[PDB]
Amino acid sequence: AGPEIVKLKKILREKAVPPGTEVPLDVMRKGMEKVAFKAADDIQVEQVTVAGCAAEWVRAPGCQAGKAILYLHGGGYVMGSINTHRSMVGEISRASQAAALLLDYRLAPEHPFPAAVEDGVAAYRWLLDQGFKPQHLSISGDSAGGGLVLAVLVSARDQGLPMPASAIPISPWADMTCTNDSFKTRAEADPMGGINKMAARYLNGADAKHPYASPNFANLKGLPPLLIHVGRDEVLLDDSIKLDAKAKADGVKSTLEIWDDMIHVWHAFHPMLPEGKQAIVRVGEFMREQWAA
């Protein structure tokens, strides 16, 4: 294990709330806002309204005309924002050489399932109506947003929408049931259930096996080529392994990368984690590969 990830895990545990204490949602929300990384100063930003939602066009230098990424942020479907993810999305824009549409989709419990999926699908539809070709598009997202990526694709496909050139779920949460073995077998090495409460907030009585809630139970047939990033040291490991397997069986060209010693959305720690930078570079490279094909 690299020195950076070791020290990163140390800091995270030293700074985290003990297991089982209930942090109010508005407290978690504000805490996530305050620890959010400042985006690099060469990242340009433009506010837009997309499908009734606030959003930002996130443009790193080197962005190609005609291309775009719909980005869906993490936050367990109950938190996160444009601000919390602007830094990581800028670096994805940089590696992929394409501007990114960072969507402030509707959150639970104010807006429970399927609000987030509706916003994702409509935002993707918005991109199309703006004149972006399907072959010039990609959809990416982390954690809850990584599951949201797959749900948006499946929903859009059921509604007759054309598929984009690629999709890259990062540490996706694709199973609301949280019954996978890695929740037990990787729990020791994961410094990042509170997750069950978030699932309860998002679902609000809905079936946890609903395809648009938990894409690991969805029909993935027809989906674009997948790059799935996940850390070996996270409780959501099996979500990614099972997603890959599901995609394979449903005909989808899927590529699963389990990064050793890595934690949940390690990409977000790119300022101090070389593997975080590396994986972001990989994401952008995969996007460009699928566009040049």
Residue boundaries of the structural domains of the chain: 1-293
The most distant pair of C-alpha atoms in the chain lies apart, rounded to whole Å, by 50
- At residue 55, what are phi and psi to the nearest 5 degrees? -155, 170
Say if CB 192 and CB 249 are below 8 A apart. no
Report the alpha-carbon distance of residue 293 to residue 223 in Å, rounded.
16
Report the alpha-carbon distance of residue 69 to residue 138 in Å, rounded.
5
Instruction: Count CB neighbours of 3 within 10 A.
Output: 8
Which structure tokens are listed for 112? 């429970």
Report the alpha-carbon distance of residue 59 to residue 94 in Å, rounded.
8
What residue type is assigned to position 138 of the chain? S
> What is the C-alpha radius of gyration for the chain, rounded to an integer number of angstroms?
17
1-293 classified as CATH 3.40.50.720: no
Q: Which residues are catalytic, by number? A: 143, 234, 264
Element (H, E) at 276: helix 274-291
What residue type is assigned to position 246 of the chain? K
Report the alpha-carbon distance of residue 87 to residue 273 in Å, rounded.
14
3-state helix/strand/coil string of 226-250: EEEEEECCCCCHHHHHHHHHHHHHC
Report the alpha-carbon distance of residue 200 to residue 131 in Å, rounded.
38
Q: What does each C-alpha distance from 246 to 69, 82, 130, 241, 281 come to in angstroms?
A: 24, 31, 32, 9, 26
Report the alpha-carbon distance of residue 184 to residue 236 in Å, rounded.
10
Report the alpha-carbon distance of residue 186 to residue 184 in Å, rounded.
6
- At residue 38, what are phi and psi to the nearest 5 degrees? -70, 135
| Of 172, 175, 152, 173, nearest in space to 164 by CA | 152
